[PDB]
Write a protein that binds this ligand. Structure first.
Ligand SMILES: *C(=N)[C@H](C[C@@H]1CCNC1=O)NC(=O)[C@@H]1[C@@H]2[C@H](CN1C(=O)[C@@H](NC(=O)C(F)(F)F)C(C)(C)C)C2(C)C
Ligand SMILES: *C(=N)[C@H](C[C@@H]1CCNC1=O)NC(=O)[C@@H]1[C@@H]2[C@H](CN1C(=O)[C@@H](NC(=O)C(F)(F)F)C(C)(C)C)C2(C)C
Lengths: 302, 303
């Protein structure tokens, strides 16, 4: 038993991390097959980042302007192209440690593991949930750009995030591996607003099932609710509306515990209106929305 | 910026995880050079675990009774020995992925990453802190025994923990890599009590420094207390007494923020005496003692 925020084993991703330097700017790159993917602001000087014209900046660069280092060995760049906010550097050597992979675009509420890197070297691994406003609460310092987010399904690494920036609220923003930002953000050093966040309801419910599986039951009772009436309470407390699709996704956890989804919704509705009154659920004094139903099934059944 | 509970990259350890089967019991082993380390209770049937005589149970096992698998490759067992609560199986092949390593015994308050494994396959990584009563709050299911805890210092993997059991309270217990349990626990299926816990004061202070480094300053106040006065408060709220050695270990964080340890102790004194009043620090509604000063320094620099 026990319930802990857990990251995927990072080994397969560690074998893909490289260092990319363009002039005075160094960041991380992801080496898959003969291509190194990295944030395009590697071509910027400090002043360029205030209002960069990336197409003009890239025209000024040639293959020899990109220093790519895999450990202590230099990889020769033989081609370069910009795709959205990502740079693709064709190298003359295919990564012998390339795992089976795919590039995916994730949705709000979904989680992924981040392998935080500096100078092409891995420093730590932690889990992130993509917020309703397309930001993540990570841990990223200077030089962390190009660090990636991923999920692993047995032997296949699904890359979903690449780190680009930190917003004025301390939250983090980035792109998918095709260079498209999650959210309304741009890679320019200018003040940018993230939308209002909303709590990921299906995830809070998933965590309440993880708590039940671990021995917590005080929030449980014979009360129930319609989907419509729970959604009125959800709007008041800034929670996402629960849909039949979300109820369906919670089915496996509901079957495992014998507690119907709308029965757990009645419990959640009560926790928001009445509060916890001095107690902790799974070591937390707050309701947590950073775990998906799949993250819960991963630790509470298999 | 941003402060997060973080595990070490696990690649080096993933390359050492194997599956160990003895009869109907399967768990994980750690393959270093030509030796596989695993919990000795792999030799037990479910009935044996209630009151095992490990010496007699092992005498009835031969090398052929142990099946060790690395991926889909059988590693032939050519020798077996028991050291405390660990079984050491000598195999016919040296692990070509053996990293540079040490076996260390950690103290309460110290942290490590656990690479949770099932059937010799790593499934997840998370950080654990060794509590004052020598237990950890982990996430371990059936077949997780043999999963290890470790710290990485650049290229060297310091293995400090091997998982063995879960206590009636839901907390977890295990041994160092020499098979000596942390705490008063024995590897027998019998109710065992963990000590009363005490909060790790120096870790709470390190986490308050992490909070200030990340813009969380509401709890900072204009007062500076003394070590003696802080210790009067700590003994009332079940916190460890702060020592000069602990103040010394906090030096780098105190220097990086320009906030003296006794200025931060006055913030902690006020948080304990007045409570957090429903307010949060680094997203938490509770004071956290799961981070060492080294974890805060390592993370806030980007080692
Ligand atoms: C990439 N290595 C860094 C990662 C940043 C550094 C501090 N924390 C992080 O996560 N990315 C940047 O420095 C990007 C980069 C220029 C500016 N920048 C920012 O993240 C800045 N933020 C913004 O300007 C904002 F708010 F719009 F997101 C900074 C003020 C430095 C935090 C570019 C090209 C966006
Ligand atoms: C090894 N794979 C498991 C890991 C356990 C399974 C559930 N969560 C865990 O951490 N270890 C065991 O099954 C050990 C093993 C016999 C019994 N045991 C326990 O963890 C039991 N606990 C105890 O008897 C206690 F309280 F003393 F710790 C159990 C009731 C199954 C949780 C031996 C040899 C200790």
């Amino acid at each position: 038993s026990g319930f802990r925020k857990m990251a995927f084993p990072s080994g397969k991703v560690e074998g893909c991390m490289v260092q990319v330097t363009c002039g005075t700017t160094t960041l991380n790159g992801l080496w898959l097959d003969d291509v190194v993917y990295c944030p395009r602001h590697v071509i910027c000087t400090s002043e360029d980042m205030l209002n960069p014209n990336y197409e003009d900046l890239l025209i000024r660069k040639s293959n020899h302007n990109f220093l790519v280092q895999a450990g202590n060995v230099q990889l020769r760049v033989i081609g370069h192209s910009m795709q959205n906010c990502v740079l693709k550097l064709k190298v003359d050597t295919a990564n012998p440690k390339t795992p089976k992979y795919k590039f995916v675009r994730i949705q709000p509420g979904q989680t992924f593991s981040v392998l935080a890197c500096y100078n092409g070297s891995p420093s730590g691994v932690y889990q992130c949930a993509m917020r309703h406003n397309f930001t993540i609460k990570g841990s990223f310092l200077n030089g962390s750009c190009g660090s990636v987010g991923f999920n692993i399904d047995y032997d296949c690494v699904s890359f979903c995030y690449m780190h680009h920036m930190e917003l004025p609220t301390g939250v983090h923003a980035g792109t998918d591996l095709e260079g498209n930002f999650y959210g309304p953000f741009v890679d320019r050093q200018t003040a940018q607003a993230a939308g209002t966040d909303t709590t990921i309801t299906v995830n809070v419910l998933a965590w309440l099932y993880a708590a039940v599986i671990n021995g917590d039951r005080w929030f449980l009772n014979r009360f129930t609710t319609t989907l419509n009436d729970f959604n009125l309470v959800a709007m008041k407390y800034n929670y996402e509306p629960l849909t039949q699709d979300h109820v369906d996704i919670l089915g496996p956890l509901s079957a495992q515990t014998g507690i119907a989804v709308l029965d757990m919704c009645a419990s959640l509705k009560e926790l928001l209106q009445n509060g916890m009154n001095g107690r902790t659920i799974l070591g937390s004094a707050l309701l947590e929305d950073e775990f998906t139903p799949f993250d819960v099934v991963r630790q509470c059944s298999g």
